[model samples]
Target: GGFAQIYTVKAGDSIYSIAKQFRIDAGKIIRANELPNPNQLVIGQSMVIPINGTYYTVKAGDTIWKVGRKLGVSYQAIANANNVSVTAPLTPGRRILIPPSPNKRNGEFLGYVETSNRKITPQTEKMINQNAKYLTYLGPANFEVQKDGSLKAPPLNNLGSIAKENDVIFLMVLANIENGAFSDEVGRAILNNKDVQDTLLNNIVKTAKEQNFRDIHFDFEFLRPADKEAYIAFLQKAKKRLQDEQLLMSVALAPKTSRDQKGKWYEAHDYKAIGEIANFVVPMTYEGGPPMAVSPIGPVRDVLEYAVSEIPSSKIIMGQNLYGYDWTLPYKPGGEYAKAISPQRAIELAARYKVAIQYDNKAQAPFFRYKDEQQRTHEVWFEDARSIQAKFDLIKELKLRGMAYWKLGLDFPQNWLLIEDNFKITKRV
Candidate 1:
């Protein structure tokens, strides 16, 4: 019912001054803007001024100032939406729209679903049910590139019926996997060999056409640094072919801080090139070395800061996780691996152990420790309402293309509620 008012910074404006002028608390400006440094406010940056009230119906004696007192919105905006004089007498029972605040922006929401099973499982079905209205793009992580660059076509799961019903844009997601892993050897194989690359493109185009998939999303990972140019070239050619068919091409890229970022996974991503080539890029920010939150807010913000430097915030779909980690404590690296668990499961464990769940404000993530039946102490990190709210605020702050959840089938119902409240989730149709 309530909406935000946008205020652009002038040279003389400071966060405190703006808050004072608008009658909002100073912290509202900082939290709503996701200000990394509260001391810096750039000129020309658009800030959403939060108004914390809802639509109200006019009573016999109600006046504009009465509404403003309740909502903390400017009286001018209410009159603007009402198309009335501020002193005009109000009629009883008239539902007031209250503000002329144009919608800030709608955000795109994407979800990845693995198609290991040929048919829909209960897990996938519940994920679909939970996310149907909010999801903009639903990607089935289906295709795996082979050595010869032909996708043995990971048996395309029949999700067309669902996509049609929901008006969700379904993506044919492709990746380089060998022996159940993302293989650099295979990525190199596909890129270095021109004939194989051509065959692969042809296969993708043909498969997309046959199945009516409007989006072709590539998740080519672990490429050698030498193939960086080749990968960009492949994407350039891929975009032309897909656009020729009136389809869109998007890429899922490993998160990187810079072009020279080290490691097989990060080095070849080439954000500048990829941003220019693909229709949009999904920065896989959920990925991190664990003993920590899988997608800590600080690291995600770091990735976003680097990402927006190259790609327009509009073209980046920031990644989020539906799962979290339970690390058996005394944190040894490369020992027994941390167990992956869902946010919902984390709560049940918290309840069973009667432990108070604590949050890390820096990470904008929640964690707590509990002793098990074996008396082994464990630290669990997961998303909660507060953490999810922080992520939502980040999207609004940065104005990025909405967020994409890594893999569905893990429960995070708070995300569902927050997204619906915070965004007008887009639909392709």
Candidate 2:
């Protein structure tokens, strides 16, 4: 029940012409746009075309019956919609229409490409190329902030060109970190010192312009609770400067279900204020951390639900994890941290140990248990097509702005294929 199309009115364009162009009824367009007068459309006006069906392309060995079954629609219904006989043969490369499937939506895809080696690797480039068309924004997770409020840019790389060539917006990610780890001291320093705050904001603006980034994403974490208001103020000032330059500002917030949620990480993030100030707020709604020092990684549904309750759904880009974690059995406090691993690797580990993966219905995630060479038991939880699709279902159910992957550069073909087939990803603004 979301928009099927968002067409920008052109010179000499009308609702009738647009409806004809999209092969939809003219009345649907008018009603969707709530046009006071069907003939009074201004040039550059945006209109949402209500989605009634899903588009499918024919492939070898495809048939009307198969498509109808796959899409959960009757063959006759699809045939009638596409103006074709039910018995007609499907030709490869031919386009057709099918009933819309559950979980399909016209939402943005925002992905993070981490620059670990200070540059984009060939593998990362291949990933960006493969998934670029489905991504709205490609953020290079590279920048870090020092205690003095100065930014440390990663070594210049080809990420910008790769993103640009694919029509994806490149967003510069600014983190509140002093070396490699998130530093509360650094966040406090920036928030408390007016001079440093100004310097940091100015540097961010300057760097974004020089790097040709039209969006700046703040990933500040572990902020002091005392600096909550100051953090909001910083975002306010940052938004003004970025807006003045016609750029967008986005923020990554810690997951919290209430205003008084405990923990330093969650306390400092003011969801309502950030929603009001930034162009969008991405709540890190994944990583339901290890409980009792050992737990499964799964979706934070409650966290996301709380966020949308506070922030406008249009301004929320729900955050997701494309990876998982491995915890050792017989967990001891402060012994060893859970190791992060990609979904593909998680599957490989399961197969290598000849174990079946288990699913948690409550979390809508997958997990498995195995033993290492040293007879040490281990538990792994990660996202696969099933888990990822569950997250997509939530996105469509909530009608949120979109979903953003925490970090890329992993081998997850099934996830990409499903996303491309069932959802529509927006290009750069």
Candidate 3:
């Protein structure tokens, strides 16, 4: 008889959610199996729960630094257990043990959306459009913001019309001011730049009123560190504006490991502050993509370990990615953009070319490469049912309010299957 977290893979059991239930860290479970896609947990499989005084199995894209962050265990513990140096880089497939304890938590299902192209195939839309509970709306990030911060005269095309017809929360992502791509920086700049702020706030309220939306979502990226206070101030003002109109205000923050962290994006987002100020904060947990150089993107255990420290579990909307990146080999100085690929495409490519599926514990992503017609070697890391399941484990363990997807247009069958297989999505009021 063992005291391990014994789990029989059912329809949907994510590694992260398992960790949450067991109070065992999700990363540790992946490390133990040396898994690639934490989201792709298999059904009918027996997963070993890494509990108490256990070491982790290292995977690709894992550095001692990142590994240290995921486990809530120290970097030194990894170095000492693995007999490696403090500055030594972590190797994939090497198991680094961790000491476990009581009361660990998981993430929640906040919401998700399709940015511009809302007319996704019906087969896909059924799962998403009907999922108004987890998917608040289908946002159009570049919807033109007007001088008065109102839709120039009318709403967008087809997708916007459909959303309005459904009584769904159609979120309009406005990123103009700070220019991090999302309206985040500009949202902050609104305080100093009253004109810009007024336009945005007005447009936001305008849309909410016309659309009868539940709330407005802010998706700003690369926020300046110095603008932390500015961001807070902007949030205060935005909150008031939306509140007066009886609309909810949600701020999307850059994901960070520590408070007072350096960087344009991480610095400005104070989890504690956002927890206090906004209706919800969507923290980007993805972007650690791989070519074996970048840390494995998505919700690797270490990153979330840090996320919970500053933010309240319920107030946080864990970021999930429906896409993955493809990195070229030999590490060129100016390589191609991390080519985006969906989980389904990844599997198809792998199967077509007979590329064996491989798991990287450290990276927490699934990847395989094949030579194309031109004889070029390409490596891809993407999300799938297994990875989604793994991440859901983290959500359950943390007991978070919910999760949010970067966008919804990219079709991933397993993601919907896996998510529905796991927890209950929140419905609109």
Candidate 4:
């Protein structure tokens, strides 16, 4: 849990070698140390080796067996690693080291399934089984806002059973969309009108019960600045009602660092207040894609730093994007749309076009450029194993609650493989 090891950089030592010795990713070491160039390591420099385990401070009434069980490791292993006898008494306030064990250790995985026709595909279900402890379905996008303060919820097709069979906690995602698009007017109406808020909350609670969902994910985006306090009030009421029903509340907040941050999206998201209120407060940190140039998909470092500065990491679930944007060359402002591409597809495109993928060390992400059949140049930015590892390292380094994938239904097996190899998804049922 604490600093794994601060190994002094020795002669002939590279990031790859150090990472190999520790059995961790080089990206982890690079991000942990904030190295400008992975290849430009200076001799005799002190670098932190990002280890794959956690440290526990022994507590009262805690036995070696209890600690080992909690960490999903054998007591003998813990005793041997921490230099404590298996028969020796574990003293309170003393630190105990717990080694990493696959499928039996750290971190929580939250996956967002963007359903099509209210039905999750077999592929998506498989993805959830391997990667997620909490599954949020994006089926409530169109909350038909009625005149008398009511919502006609969409059908949640077999999601509850899908989640239950997989032992993943199901969460219903609620968005402020009147039709297909994000309607700030709709968000404002619900936030401002008390009756509408109550009615919406009532319908939501009822739907949660009917659909067998124990969690609600509120993704109310693009609210008017005037509705800041109203939004917070609505959240307070919704949380109380959900809690009264013994349901969990999770809010997807706009990426905001400061209280006075300028933007329609940021103004309504009060980080401190939401951090205090919701069981899980997720900041959308994956929108910082480089528009026309070669840039990273997300600014992982800045977003997390700002988020933890205001909100406690314990209650924070950092958001990550599983896809990337493909922007056409000779870009003009407000002229072209950047198509969303999967990481696997990005790799395929790179290979098909005979382009070499390059990494941006500052962003800790990879990008490459290639030409299409029409001879038009295009630049693609996406997450690979390296970039995803960097983000995972940030989560461990910050010790945040966990990570939530923005949308999962894509064929990104490499990302999932890295996740499976590195993290033991925590399940709370």
Best by lDDT: 1
TM agreement with the true structure for every prediction:
0.77, 0.75, 0.66, 0.72
Tens digits of per-residue lDDT for model 1, 15-85: 78877666569897676545543555544334455553224667887898778777757887777766788
Q: Give the runs in model 3 whose Cα sits over 4 Å from its true position.
A: 1-138, 142-168, 177-189, 288-300
Clash pairs detected, candidate 1:
none
* Model 4: lDDT to the true structure: 0.69
Candidate 3's residue-wise lDDT over 299-414, tens digit each?
34556667677667677667777887776664475556667776656666665665666666555556777788878888877765455666666677776666777666565655
Highest TM-score scorer: 1
What TM-score does prediction 2 earn? 0.75
Which regions of candidate 4 deviate over 4 angstroms?
A: 1-105, 116-148, 152-155, 288-298
Where's the lowest-lDDT run of ten residues in candidate 1? 45-54
Better of 1 and 2 by lDDT: 1
Worst 10 residues of 2 by lDDT: 288-297
Give the per-residue lDDT digits (tens) of candidate 4, residues 1-429.
Answer: 122344545567788887765556888777655454467554433445554455576789888877777766888987877667777887787556677654433666677766524666676666556444333322323345553457656555455666777667677777776657667788877788888878888888887788777778888888888888888898899889999999989888887656688888778788888877898888887763345322243555666778888788877777888888798887776677789887767766765776666767677667778999999999888776566666767787787877788676665555554554466666666
Q: Considering lDDT, which of the candidate structures 3 and 4 is the better prediction for this target?
A: 4
The whole-model C-alpha lDDT of candidate 3 against the native structure comes to 0.59
lDDT agreement with native, every candidate: 0.76, 0.74, 0.59, 0.69
For model 2, the stretches where C-alpha displacement exceeds 4 angstroms are 1-104, 116-120, 288-299
